[PDB]
Amino acid sequence: MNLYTVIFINILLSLTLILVAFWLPQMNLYSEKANPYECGFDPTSSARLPFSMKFFLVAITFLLFDLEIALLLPLPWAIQTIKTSTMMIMAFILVTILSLGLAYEWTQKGLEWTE
C-alpha cells in the first residue's frame, strides 16, 4: 500500500496542478485563438487523415525483437541451474537466430524506408 500511496500522491499532485492551471487564470476565448496553428495561415485539410508510415516493417520486427527480449530476460535465473550447458547452447541459438533474421532483413533492405 506504500507504492499505491506514492502513486496516488503523484496523481493528486498532477491533478491539483492542472486544476490550478485552469481555474486560477483569466480566459478570453474566441474562435480565432482556439483553431489549429499551421504557422499563421489556416490548414488546407484535417490532421485526422492518413500519415503514411515508411518504417512499418521496422515496427513489426521491433515487435518480434521485443518478444526475443522477453525470452532472453529469464537468464539471471536460468544461470543458477545445475546444467549451465543446455542454457548456454539454447541462448546462443536464440541470439544467433535473431542476428540471422536481422541480417536477412538488412540485406533485403527492410531496414531501409519506403521512399
Binding site: Q26, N28, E32, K33, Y37, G40, F41, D42
Partner: protein, 156 residues
Amino acid sequence: SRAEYVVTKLDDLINWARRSSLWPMTFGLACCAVEMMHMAAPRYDMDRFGVVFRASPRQADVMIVAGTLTNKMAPALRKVYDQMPEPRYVVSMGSCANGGGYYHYSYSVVRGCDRIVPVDIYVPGCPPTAEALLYGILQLQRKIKREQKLKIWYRR
C-alpha cells in the same frame, strides 16, 4: 495588514513573474530581426533577463514585429497574435512596423502594425540598435510592473 495592501503586494508578485519571464516569439520578417539576433547574441544577452525565444505562439508572452508588414502577411500576424494566450504584449520594432516606414507609400504595405495588432511599445530605428530594442524591452518590463489589476478588481 489591509486587504488592499495585500492585493497590491500580490500584484507586485505576479507582475514580477510575468516581467522576469516574458517569452518572445521567433517571428522576424526583415532586417530588424538581425538586430534582434544581435540582442540574443552574447553582448546584449537577453536570457540574462529571462527573455528566451519560443517558436510556438502559445508558449509565448510577447511578439516583436521586427520587420516590414505587408498586405500578404497581415492575416498571418493577426492569427498569431490571436493564438497567443492572454496576458500578451506587442513590441513594434522599426520604422517599417511602427509606421509604414521607408515603404509607407507603397501598394503592398500596411502603414503600421497599429492597424492589425495593438502595440504596447514602439522602438524607432532603421534598424534599431539592439541596445535600443533592449531598452524598449526593459521599458515593457516597467510597463508590466505597474499593471494594477487585482487592485482595481478589489475596487470594482
